[PDB]
Every structure is written in structure tokens, then in C-alpha cells.
Amino acid sequence: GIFFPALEQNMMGAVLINENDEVMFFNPAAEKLWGYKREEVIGNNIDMLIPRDLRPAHPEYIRHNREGGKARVEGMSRELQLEKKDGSKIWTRFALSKVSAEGKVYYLALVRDAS
Amino acid sequence: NAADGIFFPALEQNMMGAVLINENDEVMFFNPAAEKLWGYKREEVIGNNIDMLIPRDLRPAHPEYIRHNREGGKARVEGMSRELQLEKKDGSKIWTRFALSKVSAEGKVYYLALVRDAS
Ligand code: HEM
Ligand code: HEM
Questions:
Q1: Is A99 touching B (CB cutoff 8 A)?
Q2: Contact at 8 Å (CB) between A101 and B9?
Q3: What CATH number labels B1-119?
Q4: Closest CA to B113 of B100, B104, B97, B102
């Protein structure tokens, strides 16, 4: 269809995760933001895409959002610091969305450069 | 068909509005997030031209913006992200944040504008 090509060729990065926080999607816009190729990210946990200073705390924020039930995600509204592979940091804007797909809970983070 | 997958429900249940148009400038997609931004139902937008979602003061210039990008090619390069004044159905105006993209599929050209509230 036109839905896979739309997110794949989106100017905004697109990081979909499944029920176990495993990255199932990582388009070329997200490859330039994070400095990771899609081969390095797919299958592994979300941990790598989270900054190292926020690594310990972030898994509890995802788990709490799943048990809540709420459709609309109110978190990650203002500018946040994305960390790349090489360690350098750029400012960004996340548009996080809960996605009821395949009888499970997902999360799509649409990211852009807000430098 | 597409609702059984993961990519349709990603854009359909996205917090950002999602307006897709095909090669003939006809809106083939209009999720519930875009229904609240524009004040239009999905039935009022699907099948109709793109100029209905453009503000009336920007209607003279917008058909020539789309036409130029189609003739350009440029080995494909999405476009841009900026803040644009959206005009609703009732006539009121809110400021937003578009994120226009260019998506080649089946040898045709489409455009997905991801919108959110910037007020
Ligand atoms: C640049 C990398 C990221 C950073 C720095 C980051 C940072 C944060 C922070 C600080 C919070 C807690 C604060 C708040 O409510 O805003 C949060 C919440 C959350 N994040 Fe992340 N995040 C990143 C990437 C992601 C990705 C890729 C996903 C999944 C696609 C994700 C999913 C979530 C979820 C589900 C919450 C819970 C929000 C809520 O309870 O409403 N994050 N993030
Ligand atoms: C709130 C309604 C909209 C407004 C006010 C608006 C405004 C504009 C403006 C001002 C430009 C010129 C580019 C610039 O000066 O930055 C433009 C270009 C363009 N617009 Fe719209 N737009 C709207 C909705 C849409 C939608 C929904 C689509 C299709 C999904 C679309 C497709 C395009 C395309 C393909 C271009 C050419 C980009 C370029 O090469 O400059 N517009 N629009």
C-alpha cells in the first residue's frame, strides 16, 4: 500500500517498538538523527536509542504508560536531547503516539531536528 | 487489509494529523487527528481536491507550489518542516507545525503532511 512507503520516506525519523520494547521499524530519517543504520537497531531493545544518562529511568516510564490504558500519550511534549552513536548530542522534537496494532500495544516516535 | 498490519494503525492512531494526497491532488487519507485540527469529518475530505484544506487567502498560490515540486524531481527529497496558519471549516484560524514529505510508490507521486498544534 501507501502506508509503509509514507513512514519509510518521511522526513521525520520513525521508531516503532513492539510490546517488548523491541524496535521493529527504523527509517532513513532516523538513521541520520541517531547515527545508527537500521540493521544495527532492528530486533534489539529500545535501550540503545535512549541517551545513556536516561538509560535506567526510561524503561519504567514505558511500563507505566502501558498499564495506564490511556490512548493519548501526554509525555515527551517539549524539546528533548537525543544522543547519537558517537556520543554527540542534538536537540529534537518527539511526537509520541500509542498504536493499537496486531492485538498489542506499540509506540511510534516521530522525530525532527529542532537545533 | 492494511488495518491488519502495523503501518496503517501507526498513521491512523497518530497524535499528529495525517493528510495524504495522490498524483491527482485528491485526499486519499485523513485520520481522526486531522479531523480535530481542521474541523472536517473524514467523509467531507476524502475524494476531494487538496485546495479545500488550504486557507482561502493562500489558495491562489498553493496549486503552483505543488505543481513545481512534481515537475522538479530532484532525485526525491521530501521537502521541509515549518509553522503554517491552518484555516478550519468554521473560519477560525490556529497556528500549527507541518512536516511535509514526498513518497514515491508504484511510479507515482504522493505527499504526506504531518500536522500538530503549535498554539
Ligand atoms: C531521544 C531518545 C529519547 C529520549 C531522550 C526520551 C526521553 C523520555 C523521557 C525523559 C520521558 C519521561 C518524561 C516525559 O513524560 O516526557 C519519556 C517518556 C516516554 N517515552 Fe521516551 N525518550 C526517547 C525515545 C523514546 C522512543 C523511541 C520511544 C518509543 C517509540 C519512547 C517511549 C516513551 C514512552 C511510551 C514514555 C511514557 C510517556 C508517558 O507516560 O506519557 N521514548 N521519554
Ligand atoms: C494548512 C493548510 C496548508 C497550508 C497553509 C500550506 C501552505 C503551504 C506553503 C506556504 C507552501 C510554500 C512553501 C513555503 O513557502 O514554505 C506550501 C507548499 C507545498 N504544499 Fe502546502 N500547505 C497546507 C497543506 C498542505 C497539504 C495537506 C499538502 C499535501 C499533503 C500540501 C502540499 C504541498 C506541497 C507538495 C508543497 C510544495 C513544497 C515545495 O516544494 O515548496 N500542503 N504549502
A1: yes
A2: yes
A3: 3.30.450.20
A4: B100
Between 3.40.50.800, 3.40.30.10, 3.20.20.70, 3.30.450.20, what CATH number should domain A1-115 receive?
3.30.450.20
Query: How distant is the Cα of B103 from the closest Cα of chain A, in angstroms?
Result: 6
This structure's resolution (angstroms)? 1.5
Cα three-residue angle A51-A52-A53, rounded to 5 degrees? 95
Contacts of B19 in chain A (CB under 8 A): none
This entry's atomic model was obtained through X-ray
| Cβ atoms < 10 Å from Cβ of A68 | 10
- A99 near B13, Cβ under 8 Å? yes
CA–CA separation, B49 and A38 (whole Å): 36
Ligand 1: which atom is nearest the Cα of residue A65? 40
Asked if B111 has any chain A CB less than 8 Å from its own CB, the reply is no
